[PDB]
Amino acid sequence: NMKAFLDELKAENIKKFLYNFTQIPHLAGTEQNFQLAKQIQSQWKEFGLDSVELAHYDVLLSYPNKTHPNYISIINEDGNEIFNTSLFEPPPPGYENVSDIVPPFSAFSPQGMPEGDLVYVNYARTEDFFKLERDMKINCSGKIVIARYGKVFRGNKVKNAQLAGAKGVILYSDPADYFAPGVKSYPDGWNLPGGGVQRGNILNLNGAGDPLTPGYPANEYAYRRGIAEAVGLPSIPVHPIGYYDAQKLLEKMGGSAPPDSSWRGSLKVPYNVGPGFTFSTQKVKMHIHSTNEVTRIYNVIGTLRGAVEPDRYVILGGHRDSWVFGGIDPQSGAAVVHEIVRSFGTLKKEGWRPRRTILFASWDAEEFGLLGSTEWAEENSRLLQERGVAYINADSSIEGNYTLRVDCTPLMYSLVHNLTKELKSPDEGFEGKSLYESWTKKSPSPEFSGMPRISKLGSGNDFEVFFQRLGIASGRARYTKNFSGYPLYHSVYETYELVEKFYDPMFKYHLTVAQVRGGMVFELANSIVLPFDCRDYAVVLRKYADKIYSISMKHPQEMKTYSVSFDSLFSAVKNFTEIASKFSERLQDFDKSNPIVLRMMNDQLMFLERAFIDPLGLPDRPFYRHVIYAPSSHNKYAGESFPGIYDALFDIESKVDPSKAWGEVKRQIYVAAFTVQAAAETLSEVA
Amino acid sequence: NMKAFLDELKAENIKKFLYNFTQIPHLAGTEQNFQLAKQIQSQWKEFGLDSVELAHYDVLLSYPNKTHPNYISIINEDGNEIFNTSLFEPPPPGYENVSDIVPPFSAFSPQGMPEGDLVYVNYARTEDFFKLERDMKINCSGKIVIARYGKVFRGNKVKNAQLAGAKGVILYSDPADYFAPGVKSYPDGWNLPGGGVQRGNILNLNGAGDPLTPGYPANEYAYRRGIAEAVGLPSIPVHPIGYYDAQKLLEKMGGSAPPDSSWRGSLKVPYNVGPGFTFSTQKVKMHIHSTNEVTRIYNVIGTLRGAVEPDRYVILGGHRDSWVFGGIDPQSGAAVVHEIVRSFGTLKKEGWRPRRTILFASWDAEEFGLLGSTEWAEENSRLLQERGVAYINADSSIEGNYTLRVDCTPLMYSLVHNLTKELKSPDEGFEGKSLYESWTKKSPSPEFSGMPRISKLGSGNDFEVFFQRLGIASGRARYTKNFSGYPLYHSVYETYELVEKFYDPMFKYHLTVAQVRGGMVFELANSIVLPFDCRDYAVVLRKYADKIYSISMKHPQEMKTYSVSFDSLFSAVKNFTEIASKFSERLQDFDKSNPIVLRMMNDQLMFLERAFIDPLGLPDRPFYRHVIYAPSSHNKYAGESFPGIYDALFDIESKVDPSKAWGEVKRQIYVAAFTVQAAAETLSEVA
Ligand SMILES: *[C@@H]1O[C@H](CO)[C@@H](O[C@@H]2O[C@H](CO)[C@@H](O[C@@H]3O[C@H](CO)[C@@H](O)[C@H](O[C@H]4O[C@H](CO)[C@@H](O)[C@H](O)[C@@H]4O)[C@@H]3O)[C@H](O)[C@H]2NC(C)=O)[C@H](O)[C@H]1NC(C)=O
Ligand SMILES: *[C@@H]1O[C@H](CO)[C@@H](O[C@@H]2O[C@H](CO)[C@@H](O[C@@H]3O[C@H](CO)[C@@H](O)[C@H](O[C@H]4O[C@H](CO)[C@@H](O)[C@H](O)[C@@H]4O)[C@@H]3O)[C@H](O)[C@H]2NC(C)=O)[C@H](O)[C@H]1NC(C)=O
Ligand SMILES: *[C@@H]1O[C@H](CO)[C@@H](O[C@@H]2O[C@H](CO)[C@@H](O)[C@H](O)[C@H]2NC(C)=O)[C@H](O)[C@H]1NC(C)=O
Ligand SMILES: *[C@@H]1O[C@H](CO)[C@@H](O[C@@H]2O[C@H](CO)[C@@H](O)[C@H](O)[C@H]2NC(C)=O)[C@H](O)[C@H]1NC(C)=O
Ligand SMILES: *[C@@H]1O[C@H](CO)[C@@H](O[C@@H]2O[C@H](CO)[C@@H](O)[C@H](O)[C@H]2NC(C)=O)[C@H](O)[C@H]1NC(C)=O
Ligand SMILES: *[C@@H]1O[C@H](CO)[C@@H](O[C@@H]2O[C@H](CO)[C@@H](O)[C@H](O)[C@H]2NC(C)=O)[C@H](O)[C@H]1NC(C)=O
Ligand SMILES: *[C@@H]1O[C@H](CO)[C@@H](O[C@@H]2O[C@H](CO)[C@@H](O)[C@H](O)[C@H]2NC(C)=O)[C@H](O)[C@H]1NC(C)=O
Ligand SMILES: *[C@@H]1O[C@H](CO)[C@@H](O[C@@H]2O[C@H](CO)[C@@H](O)[C@H](O)[C@H]2NC(C)=O)[C@H](O)[C@H]1NC(C)=O
Ligand SMILES: *[C@@H]1O[C@H](CO)[C@@H](O)[C@H](O)[C@H]1NC(C)=O
Ligand SMILES: *[C@@H]1O[C@H](CO)[C@@H](O)[C@H](O)[C@H]1NC(C)=O
Ligand SMILES: *[C@@H]1O[C@H](CO)[C@@H](O)[C@H](O)[C@H]1NC(C)=O
Ligand SMILES: *[C@@H]1O[C@H](CO)[C@@H](O)[C@H](O)[C@H]1NC(C)=O
Ligand SMILES: *[C@@H]1O[C@H](CO)[C@@H](O)[C@H](O)[C@H]1NC(C)=O
Ligand SMILES: *[C@@H]1O[C@H](CO)[C@@H](O)[C@H](O)[C@H]1NC(C)=O
Ligand SMILES: O=C(O)CC[C@H](CP(=O)(O)O)C(=O)O
Ligand SMILES: O=C(O)CC[C@H](CP(=O)(O)O)C(=O)O
Ligand SMILES: [Ca+2]
Ligand SMILES: [Ca+2]
Ligand SMILES: [Cl-]
Ligand SMILES: [Cl-]
Ligand SMILES: [Zn+2]
Ligand SMILES: [Zn+2]
Ligand SMILES: [Zn+2]
Ligand SMILES: [Zn+2]
């Protein structure tokens, strides 16, 4: 039963697994990552799984040149390189020994050696560039942009920059965002040293997976696009730096004041916007020599065969590749999955099987754009779309230690509420209380009433292809602090010791996340009726219809002129509410003894997420096919609701053909109303 | 049981229903068609169906102007209209009374009054226009084209013509194609009078359905494209004529000889290719004033709820709208469905239910581009794709009386072989023999050995959206003669009397088709294991891989230069063969007493057709998503195999960038190999 499963999970095992996974770097595409894959595969096998395979793909990755390193220089009027950024981060204590730690770089940067004047853009958000090209009249064309990490996925920044005319982008971590007051720099606390740099890919894939093979798995005979038709590649050079190198680049900055305090970070510089220095006369020069190359990656796929519904799949998945040691990102999640597997494997050895098939993935090349999960799902899309019950992600278990952070489909809200009431809170001062209670006290619902917050799914992690492309019900759960990443994110300093010393010394937060993650997978794979509640979707559809309506209503004159009505969407939502309500009644009133009727009802619950998929995709985003949710076009990490309408409405005041534009709003309202109505009809009596 | 069902079908009932359906015209969008819909709905209800609804859509139709009729003129040097084509066909005996019979027109022609020189193009096939622009050097630009009906769908002709530069198209029926020797003109035989004209739409929809709403049902709040972005509309005027009016237009034709005898039909004219007349000096002038208009259509949808698997759908569908009386096209099929329904309804009244849900459709606006079936399937696509077992079409039951013509997915071959051996042949001189035997003797397999021919599915009928877009296993069966249509196709002369007197006086061929159609639907809806044989797909995949390979091999030098290999496709096919073979074994070896295992296996059989769908669609044909089959791009009526590769290879010698072109061949080989491999993997053990 469930308690047997939950009781078999040990904090000390997680600790032991995390330590094992963090001793050397496991960069995607390296032999070391391959060996960790082989090792996971052997162990998941010894743990009891019925089968464990490696699935590999040949995908575009990116790597710095070993003998021609990347850096940024201030040059002078003659071409003397006055200042030079780091070539590497100062390795932490006792790892000065590291074989090779990849130096900081922006994965998928083109090669280049541009120079020019600097313009500071804050976080390089859409609103930042609006304030700058619209209010301030500064002009980024031909400039090198310099932006701080935080707020939004760094891919959006590069795209915003690229589109505003920039010839290069420099990213850095500012202590305002990456140094929490009163805590020390690593190795003596969990803050980011002025020499720490955040690695990370800067693609805009929009769900495509491998850049060269959109639509189809990068298998042995894959046909690939030439790199010039590749998906998501930035066209200007980009490089990240720490805040020491940053001060050096920022302190000589001229032009206009920062437009206000929200543009100014913590270093002792003015945070002038530029362009150029006070100093005229010197320029910034970038040196980028990273190369893109097709490289083999490996997913580990374990299978625990279901006793009754083997042709129904509950998937627990998270990635194995790290930028360096992956002390938090991903091995604190990977060590949790290892212990979940060990625990299910234990029950199986004593002769239990779950009701449905459970699938366990160790994904590769996630850091490079969710490539392993995506290629695997393109290869197995027909199985997934007819057999896929749910997907539970398992990246970083902790990014803090204040409370639970849950993002999931509405179908799993009730499941998550019930599971957490059955779990002990590991929180100081809530001993003998449930996780539900601490989580609700600490992160209260905005909606209300006495409920916790649960957020929408966007992207930036491996659930993306399962939810956004395929319409498989998905959730994730981790411990969090009070979109920027904790301070030591994607740095050489994110190590086992960072976690053992400063994050979770007892491994008690890991154990909690293992219980929430393994708990969901257990209920999903074993409850006789799928634990989804379609009425929960009815409720959020109404909130999102209100929301998108309110946004349109900021423009009453155009709504009159063009006859923009939301009547069809509200009507659809009202029908989905009534039909879901009747479906719940039938679900309460039938005999679980009749298997075929059970299967029919479970198939309705199962295909309901699926009903929100449009096979034509969203406008310009063929791999984002869900109509209710998509990643924000301004921030991959953030979930947006009614994305088609949201984007047709965004900055609509600026389109030059208002009636073309409002026409497309109307078209999107129609697609949404229709999809919500069609989804609802999946829950009607079937004949 | 089956025999009870088959024995309840009566030839005399079919006769009575066909007579009832043919007394007045039932043109899509008219009140008369609406009343026939209401009537079908009441009767299917009295017959016993559990529910019967009307589903309506507002779609673009096309109609001649009542007070400004269409015709073609020869004008002279001054503008005197010397010759004028008919305004209508001479109505048949006793129907000179007809309320209104729509005059001959090409549905969806733009309006226009162009004049110019005539060029004769034979059947206006791709090869005809090749022979003419390549061999003969004649140039169709600014000319009016005149082409005979036959060989290919008239939409392709208009598209070929349009693309070759034409300013108008005139279609006519030539007696070579539409007058069988030794038979008389209607009313005294079944041949086409020199005053008969074939009506018909001339769209290129490529599966889109309603022109204005591709992707989504043309419901109440549908957003519609402006007519200029409508799908499939021809841009030059087109009008059809009989062979009397044709002789008048052809007899004065100048320019070059016909390139050979295959270009010459039966009228006493030279069949010169033009351009222009001998007569200089006079021109041809077209007068077209038809209008396009959004018009309401109605499908009748009856439901017979399944006793065990109600959430599994077997669909019997065919259209109700006719160009005029629809004596053969469609009411000889519609009267068969009426009798099938009556018969199932009888069993139900005695307390039987089929195992699966059976759905019965009377589709509207088929003649106008399969619009009713398509809109309905877009509206209900999520139900269809998860619950759809099979679709059996039911258009014209007879287009002759020589033998059976069956087109279907390979999955149904074995079903059709077994059903026909259990059926009496209605053929003169095969009394006491089975339909299988007459059908095999009369239409022998080309493949071999002692098997009948079964052809591929293309399009030109209502199964299109179910098979080509959705991947639902589909078949059709009718009686045929020894792609052009019988002689009285889409003419005022296709009447009840044409059928009672000359086609099927006993109604014995109708009864046979009712038995083959209702027989399939019965087995599909009642057999405990779905009657599909996946090994039959294995066999044809190998033949098609051979075929497409041979076509590529007409170009060995390019295959070397570009490294074009079919190794992946053959490998996929070989694996599909082995895995299908193992799947058959398991299907033989499991206990039908275990329902969940039964359901799992039926779901594999059911989703196997579905596995061949690519959600990205074929190149440029987003609504044709099946990878093994598509309608021919040169002839909608014809099925083509490995369409993606076939079209990348077609006329490849002429592409100006041979390596771009051969690259796309390679990409298509990859898509096909991958899809065949993925389809096969749906038949593997599921865990
Ligand atoms: C939510 O579910 C409800 C079903 O409970 C559903 O309501 C349906 O709405 C449509 C209109 O939106 C109705 O269709 C109408 O009724 C009949 C057809 O049976 C016609 O007379 C009407 O047509 C006339 O009026 C039209 C416009 O007002 C004209 O354009 C037209 O040419 C006619 O002259 C009209 O088609 C239908 O009756 C209800 N169904 C009910 C109440 O049972 C609603 O649409 C669902 N929401 C969504 C978004 O799907
Ligand atoms: C039909 O089914 C068979 C399975 O029975 C399947 O065969 C598979 O083919 C691929 C090659 O096409 C094999 O993968 C290889 O084997 C190992 C990985 O386990 C590697 O050593 C190989 O890689 C080396 O060589 C490559 C090229 O030759 C190099 O590019 C590469 O970098 C390596 O140095 C290679 O990946 C696989 O072993 C078999 N599976 C078997 C026999 O079990 C076949 O592909 C299926 N057909 C289709 C079209 O799917
Ligand atoms: C993590 O643990 C694994 C397995 O417990 C260690 O690898 C095993 O132990 C030794 C290492 O040579 C061998 O006898 C086994 O063959 C290894 N088993 C495998 C790979 O499954 C591994 O070395 C540990 N990693 C670290 C850095 O501690
Ligand atoms: C920053 O780095 C550059 C590159 O290594 C340094 O300039 C080089 O210096 C050597 C010897 O002085 C010369 O042979 C090269 O011509 C220089 N390379 C280039 C491309 O300029 C530079 O001195 C460094 N600057 C600082 C302040 O340390
Ligand atoms: C979460 O728990 C609640 C409370 O147990 C569950 O709702 C009950 O479920 C039973 C079983 O069908 C019903 O008979 C009760 O009427 C329900 N109570 C309420 C308040 O609805 C709910 O099913 C659980 N959610 C899951 C398991 O997903
Ligand atoms: C075809 O048969 C139908 C039904 O048998 C005829 O319509 C019915 O018969 C009379 C006609 O006014 C009425 O009492 C019924 O209400 C009609 N029933 C319906 C419409 O379901 C119909 O007129 C026949 N058509 C022809 C031309 O013979
Ligand atoms: C073919 O049809 C046209 C159109 O009806 C005939 O020409 C018309 O004749 C009347 C009276 O003679 C004139 O008022 C119109 O000007 C003509 N219309 C046009 C547009 O030309 C023509 O005579 C007919 N030709 C034959 C041979 O019957
Ligand atoms: C068509 O009929 C053949 C002959 O009856 C069927 O094949 C037999 O099916 C039974 C039932 O599984 C097997 O045990 C026999 O071994 C089969 N004989 C052969 C020659 O295969 C076949 O199943 C029928 N096809 C259908 C119903 O789709
Ligand atoms: C890296 O740069 C070296 C040293 O200058 C050069 O020889 C080599 O081409 C580069 N390797 C690649 C292509 O990354
Ligand atoms: C920015 O500067 C360049 C000239 O160097 C110009 O072409 C570009 O259009 C400018 N952008 C704006 C907003 O004026
Ligand atoms: C872990 O828990 C303590 C308790 O408040 C917290 O303040 C400390 O800073 C936490 N560690 C991190 C990395 O936030
Ligand atoms: C048909 O032509 C008539 C008569 O000349 C004209 O008045 C009317 O506009 C036309 N109707 C339409 C638009 O089909
Ligand atoms: C046919 O004629 C026109 C001139 O009237 C010309 O522009 C067009 O390109 C010609 N086509 C060919 C194949 O020469
Ligand atoms: C019907 O059957 C006879 C028997 O040969 C055939 O010759 C006759 O022409 C058929 N009718 C039609 C329309 O083909
Ligand atoms: O490519 C993405 O969508 C995200 C990759 C990675 C996700 P993770 O850092 O592993 O949480 C990142 O944000 O840089
Ligand atoms: O639009 C089509 O695809 C075909 C419509 C109709 C099919 P049918 O004549 O009813 O067999 C025709 O060929 O003109
Ligand atoms: Ca791919
Ligand atoms: Ca449509
Ligand atoms: Cl996660
Ligand atoms: Cl048919
Ligand atoms: Zn990461
Ligand atoms: Zn991660
Ligand atoms: Zn027709
Ligand atoms: Zn027809």
PDB file of N, CA and C in Angstrom, chain A residues 644-687:
ATOM      1  N   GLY A 644      -3.005  31.857 -26.958  1.00  0.00           N
ATOM      2  CA  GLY A 644      -3.342  32.333 -28.312  1.00  0.00           C
ATOM      3  C   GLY A 644      -3.994  33.724 -28.246  1.00  0.00           C
ATOM      4  N   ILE A 645      -4.970  33.886 -27.327  1.00  0.00           N
ATOM      5  CA  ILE A 645      -5.653  35.173 -27.182  1.00  0.00           C
ATOM      6  C   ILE A 645      -4.694  36.215 -26.532  1.00  0.00           C
ATOM      7  N   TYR A 646      -4.021  35.795 -25.445  1.00  0.00           N
ATOM      8  CA  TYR A 646      -3.056  36.604 -24.750  1.00  0.00           C
ATOM      9  C   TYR A 646      -2.077  37.236 -25.735  1.00  0.00           C
ATOM     10  N   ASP A 647      -1.426  36.447 -26.550  1.00  0.00           N
ATOM     11  CA  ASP A 647      -0.538  36.996 -27.556  1.00  0.00           C
ATOM     12  C   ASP A 647      -1.183  37.774 -28.705  1.00  0.00           C
ATOM     13  N   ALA A 648      -2.391  37.440 -29.086  1.00  0.00           N
ATOM     14  CA  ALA A 648      -3.000  38.283 -30.094  1.00  0.00           C
ATOM     15  C   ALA A 648      -3.287  39.668 -29.470  1.00  0.00           C
ATOM     16  N   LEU A 649      -3.638  39.697 -28.187  1.00  0.00           N
ATOM     17  CA  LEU A 649      -3.899  40.984 -27.495  1.00  0.00           C
ATOM     18  C   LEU A 649      -2.679  41.807 -27.077  1.00  0.00           C
ATOM     19  N   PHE A 650      -1.527  41.150 -26.898  1.00  0.00           N
ATOM     20  CA  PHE A 650      -0.343  41.824 -26.311  1.00  0.00           C
ATOM     21  C   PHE A 650       0.171  42.989 -27.174  1.00  0.00           C
ATOM     22  N   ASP A 651       0.328  44.174 -26.546  1.00  0.00           N
ATOM     23  CA  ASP A 651       0.825  45.360 -27.261  1.00  0.00           C
ATOM     24  C   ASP A 651       0.029  45.613 -28.581  1.00  0.00           C
ATOM     25  N   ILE A 652      -1.288  45.415 -28.511  1.00  0.00           N
ATOM     26  CA  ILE A 652      -2.080  45.425 -29.729  1.00  0.00           C
ATOM     27  C   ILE A 652      -2.194  46.857 -30.244  1.00  0.00           C
ATOM     28  N   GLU A 653      -2.113  47.815 -29.297  1.00  0.00           N
ATOM     29  CA  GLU A 653      -2.143  49.259 -29.628  1.00  0.00           C
ATOM     30  C   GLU A 653      -1.129  49.631 -30.702  1.00  0.00           C
ATOM     31  N   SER A 654      -0.068  48.841 -30.887  1.00  0.00           N
ATOM     32  CA  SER A 654       1.029  49.185 -31.815  1.00  0.00           C
ATOM     33  C   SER A 654       0.927  48.571 -33.165  1.00  0.00           C
ATOM     34  N   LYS A 655      -0.003  47.629 -33.358  1.00  0.00           N
ATOM     35  CA  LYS A 655      -0.101  47.028 -34.682  1.00  0.00           C
ATOM     36  C   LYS A 655      -0.618  48.129 -35.635  1.00  0.00           C
ATOM     37  N   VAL A 656      -0.203  48.066 -36.893  1.00  0.00           N
ATOM     38  CA  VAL A 656      -0.459  49.197 -37.784  1.00  0.00           C
ATOM     39  C   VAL A 656      -1.747  48.965 -38.579  1.00  0.00           C
ATOM     40  N   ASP A 657      -2.201  47.717 -38.575  1.00  0.00           N
ATOM     41  CA  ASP A 657      -3.482  47.388 -39.164  1.00  0.00           C
ATOM     42  C   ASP A 657      -4.416  46.893 -38.053  1.00  0.00           C
ATOM     43  N   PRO A 658      -5.117  47.826 -37.404  1.00  0.00           N
ATOM     44  CA  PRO A 658      -5.853  47.424 -36.199  1.00  0.00           C
ATOM     45  C   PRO A 658      -6.936  46.354 -36.458  1.00  0.00           C
ATOM     46  N   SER A 659      -7.431  46.305 -37.681  1.00  0.00           N
ATOM     47  CA  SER A 659      -8.517  45.408 -37.961  1.00  0.00           C
ATOM     48  C   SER A 659      -8.050  43.999 -38.353  1.00  0.00           C
ATOM     49  N   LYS A 660      -6.887  43.915 -39.021  1.00  0.00           N
ATOM     50  CA  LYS A 660      -6.175  42.649 -39.135  1.00  0.00           C
ATOM     51  C   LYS A 660      -5.947  42.133 -37.724  1.00  0.00           C
ATOM     52  N   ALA A 661      -5.334  42.957 -36.853  1.00  0.00           N
ATOM     53  CA  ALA A 661      -5.014  42.533 -35.488  1.00  0.00           C
ATOM     54  C   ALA A 661      -6.194  42.088 -34.637  1.00  0.00           C
ATOM     55  N   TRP A 662      -7.297  42.811 -34.715  1.00  0.00           N
ATOM     56  CA  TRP A 662      -8.467  42.485 -33.909  1.00  0.00           C
ATOM     57  C   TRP A 662      -9.229  41.290 -34.459  1.00  0.00           C
ATOM     58  N   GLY A 663      -9.154  41.110 -35.785  1.00  0.00           N
ATOM     59  CA  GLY A 663      -9.564  39.910 -36.485  1.00  0.00           C
ATOM     60  C   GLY A 663      -8.893  38.660 -35.907  1.00  0.00           C
ATOM     61  N   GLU A 664      -7.582  38.748 -35.619  1.00  0.00           N
ATOM     62  CA  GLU A 664      -6.825  37.611 -35.133  1.00  0.00           C
ATOM     63  C   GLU A 664      -7.200  37.331 -33.664  1.00  0.00           C
ATOM     64  N   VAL A 665      -7.387  38.372 -32.865  1.00  0.00           N
ATOM     65  CA  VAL A 665      -8.055  38.216 -31.557  1.00  0.00           C
ATOM     66  C   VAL A 665      -9.359  37.422 -31.643  1.00  0.00           C
ATOM     67  N   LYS A 666     -10.259  37.883 -32.486  1.00  0.00           N
ATOM     68  CA  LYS A 666     -11.508  37.146 -32.713  1.00  0.00           C
ATOM     69  C   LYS A 666     -11.250  35.671 -33.106  1.00  0.00           C
ATOM     70  N   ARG A 667     -10.316  35.431 -34.045  1.00  0.00           N
ATOM     71  CA  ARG A 667      -9.973  34.036 -34.447  1.00  0.00           C
ATOM     72  C   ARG A 667      -9.481  33.205 -33.261  1.00  0.00           C
ATOM     73  N   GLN A 668      -8.637  33.796 -32.443  1.00  0.00           N
ATOM     74  CA  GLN A 668      -8.174  33.106 -31.266  1.00  0.00           C
ATOM     75  C   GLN A 668      -9.303  32.847 -30.208  1.00  0.00           C
ATOM     76  N   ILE A 669     -10.267  33.799 -30.043  1.00  0.00           N
ATOM     77  CA  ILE A 669     -11.385  33.565 -29.140  1.00  0.00           C
ATOM     78  C   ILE A 669     -12.182  32.338 -29.608  1.00  0.00           C
ATOM     79  N   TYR A 670     -12.432  32.254 -30.894  1.00  0.00           N
ATOM     80  CA  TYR A 670     -13.080  31.147 -31.520  1.00  0.00           C
ATOM     81  C   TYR A 670     -12.392  29.793 -31.333  1.00  0.00           C
ATOM     82  N   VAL A 671     -11.077  29.750 -31.608  1.00  0.00           N
ATOM     83  CA  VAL A 671     -10.279  28.536 -31.328  1.00  0.00           C
ATOM     84  C   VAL A 671     -10.422  28.115 -29.851  1.00  0.00           C
ATOM     85  N   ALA A 672     -10.345  29.076 -28.922  1.00  0.00           N
ATOM     86  CA  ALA A 672     -10.394  28.740 -27.495  1.00  0.00           C
ATOM     87  C   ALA A 672     -11.744  28.200 -27.059  1.00  0.00           C
ATOM     88  N   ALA A 673     -12.814  28.899 -27.467  1.00  0.00           N
ATOM     89  CA  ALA A 673     -14.236  28.518 -27.173  1.00  0.00           C
ATOM     90  C   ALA A 673     -14.494  27.143 -27.732  1.00  0.00           C
ATOM     91  N   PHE A 674     -14.076  26.955 -28.989  1.00  0.00           N
ATOM     92  CA  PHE A 674     -14.309  25.671 -29.604  1.00  0.00           C
ATOM     93  C   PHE A 674     -13.601  24.539 -28.871  1.00  0.00           C
ATOM     94  N   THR A 675     -12.348  24.799 -28.522  1.00  0.00           N
ATOM     95  CA  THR A 675     -11.509  23.756 -27.833  1.00  0.00           C
ATOM     96  C   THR A 675     -12.053  23.432 -26.475  1.00  0.00           C
ATOM     97  N   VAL A 676     -12.535  24.458 -25.768  1.00  0.00           N
ATOM     98  CA  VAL A 676     -13.073  24.227 -24.413  1.00  0.00           C
ATOM     99  C   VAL A 676     -14.351  23.428 -24.547  1.00  0.00           C
ATOM    100  N   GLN A 677     -15.189  23.836 -25.535  1.00  0.00           N
ATOM    101  CA  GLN A 677     -16.435  23.063 -25.813  1.00  0.00           C
ATOM    102  C   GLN A 677     -16.132  21.623 -26.192  1.00  0.00           C
ATOM    103  N   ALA A 678     -15.175  21.420 -27.104  1.00  0.00           N
ATOM    104  CA  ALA A 678     -14.808  20.053 -27.515  1.00  0.00           C
ATOM    105  C   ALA A 678     -14.241  19.204 -26.374  1.00  0.00           C
ATOM    106  N   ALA A 679     -13.428  19.817 -25.525  1.00  0.00           N
ATOM    107  CA  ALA A 679     -12.914  19.136 -24.341  1.00  0.00           C
ATOM    108  C   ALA A 679     -14.021  18.660 -23.412  1.00  0.00           C
ATOM    109  N   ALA A 680     -14.982  19.531 -23.177  1.00  0.00           N
ATOM    110  CA  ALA A 680     -16.136  19.237 -22.388  1.00  0.00           C
ATOM    111  C   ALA A 680     -16.893  18.072 -22.964  1.00  0.00           C
ATOM    112  N   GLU A 681     -17.038  18.040 -24.290  1.00  0.00           N
ATOM    113  CA  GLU A 681     -17.776  16.948 -24.911  1.00  0.00           C
ATOM    114  C   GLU A 681     -17.143  15.636 -24.805  1.00  0.00           C
ATOM    115  N   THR A 682     -15.838  15.617 -24.490  1.00  0.00           N
ATOM    116  CA  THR A 682     -15.201  14.323 -24.188  1.00  0.00           C
ATOM    117  C   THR A 682     -15.722  13.719 -22.868  1.00  0.00           C
ATOM    118  N   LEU A 683     -16.350  14.537 -22.027  1.00  0.00           N
ATOM    119  CA  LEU A 683     -16.800  14.087 -20.738  1.00  0.00           C
ATOM    120  C   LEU A 683     -18.329  13.722 -20.700  1.00  0.00           C
ATOM    121  N   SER A 684     -19.052  14.070 -21.783  1.00  0.00           N
ATOM    122  CA  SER A 684     -20.424  13.630 -22.066  1.00  0.00           C
ATOM    123  C   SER A 684     -20.521  12.130 -22.146  1.00  0.00           C
ATOM    124  N   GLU A 685     -21.721  11.604 -21.905  1.00  0.00           N
ATOM    125  CA  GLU A 685     -21.942  10.195 -22.245  1.00  0.00           C
ATOM    126  C   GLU A 685     -21.511   9.965 -23.690  1.00  0.00           C
ATOM    127  N   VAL A 686     -20.920   8.801 -23.895  1.00  0.00           N
ATOM    128  CA  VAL A 686     -20.111   8.509 -25.047  1.00  0.00           C
ATOM    129  C   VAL A 686     -21.027   8.041 -26.210  1.00  0.00           C
ATOM    130  N   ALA A 687     -22.265   7.678 -25.854  1.00  0.00           N
ATOM    131  CA  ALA A 687     -23.277   7.188 -26.808  1.00  0.00           C
ATOM    132  C   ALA A 687     -24.624   7.242 -26.104  1.00  0.00           C
TER     133      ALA A 687
END
